[PDB]
Symmetry: D2
Subunit: 116 residues, 4 copies
């Protein structure tokens, strides 16, 4: 479970499905190289994006297409997209789960690490 | 699927709560919160299968989590004595409920989800 | 400028919550929640005028925030029956306490701001 | 009393965060971020002066609260590099924006209000 970046809808009381997500890597030129993207069908979870060999001991970024989400449900969010920036794998391979409790005009997140 | 479960995880250690005592009750017209079930937070910080289809009924419930015991063992002196999640259930039939519990020494937050038939 | 300030915010409309029922209790010697204070949240979203250091004493307290009146009168269908915040108070030094509540129809958050005046 | 306001609350100490560096950008026509305003946080955990209604105009803006240096000063090991809030401003008209951010060593949350 490298990045099981779960996203939850705090209004519909269901996982946020069909929400586009984008990943980036730390480029040496202070740029964000695109890495992966996708949309879900029924459940709002992220997986199968980065493999054990795809990681680096560096900075990352996760972008979630949030404004496009609510227009479909006819909601007009204040936020445009959400970004979490972190340093990973400093002490070796660990499994990272990124929380994301969305809401129109509000969001929250949390990080879960492992010992080995 | 699991009829309902409680999800709890520490926002300081970045790990699910381990050995955080939990309890459940039932609403009684005499205001007496008659105890119904209890449990201990495992290494995964989750308790599931507490209320079966027969055990659970359409009514008012409460979930109590022994937050203060969780911190003092870690040598941490928290603010909240415990937490409570008061709600209604099965308004129009049986459903699946999973609730969140983001513990921090001086704060917490909860969130619940419902899945349509 | 009170030792007990409760702020309630709407995480859908993005406005300070208004017309929200608030109740304050206190555990008695018989483990009884003797009523302490109550009120309704204004359009500023800050509840105040609930207690003073003359009336505020050491002990275990409880804070009640109604939710059904907030959304059902608004037309939204909530999940949580209400919000209950229970905490020790004035253990040593009557520090001013601020209680924060970020409300969503299916989720809420609580945080405490403590400071010695 | 400003159209833009940001406040950061520390959960572990339960006190308003102090000395939290902040920066504000603007959506440049070259898809860049021209720096707009920056600063740190006081003992009240709020922002004292960010943007007047004169400088505040339409467009997309980004605000970042520096947290990595925070917990190192606190002596705790963080996780997040920092927190990024990006939003569309003045899409329909003037308003007053307040940004609230609850910070914990391994988690954070945020929300906004309008006027
Ligand atoms: O009010 C919030 O949005 C909030 C969100 C998460 C955690 C705590 C919160 N409470 C809170 C936040 C702020 Cl910024 C605040 O005042 O700012 O001038 C108050 Cl009174 C209460």
């Amino acid at each position: 479970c490298p990045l099981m970046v779960k996203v939850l809808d705090a209004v519909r009381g269901s996982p946020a499905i069909n929400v586009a997500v984008h990943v980036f890597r730390k480029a040496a030129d202070d740029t964000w190289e695109p890495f992966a993207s996708g949309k879900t069908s029924e459940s709002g979870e992220l997986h199968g994006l980065t493999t054990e060999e795809e990681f680096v001991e560096g900075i990352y970024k996760v972008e979630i297409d949030t404004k496009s989400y609510w227009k479909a449900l006819g909601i007009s969010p204040f936020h445009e997209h959400a970004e979490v920036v972190f340093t990973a794998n400093d002490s070796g391979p660990r499994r990272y789960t990124i929380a994301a409790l969305l809401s129109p005009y509000s969001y929250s997140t949390t990080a879960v690490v492992t010992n080995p």
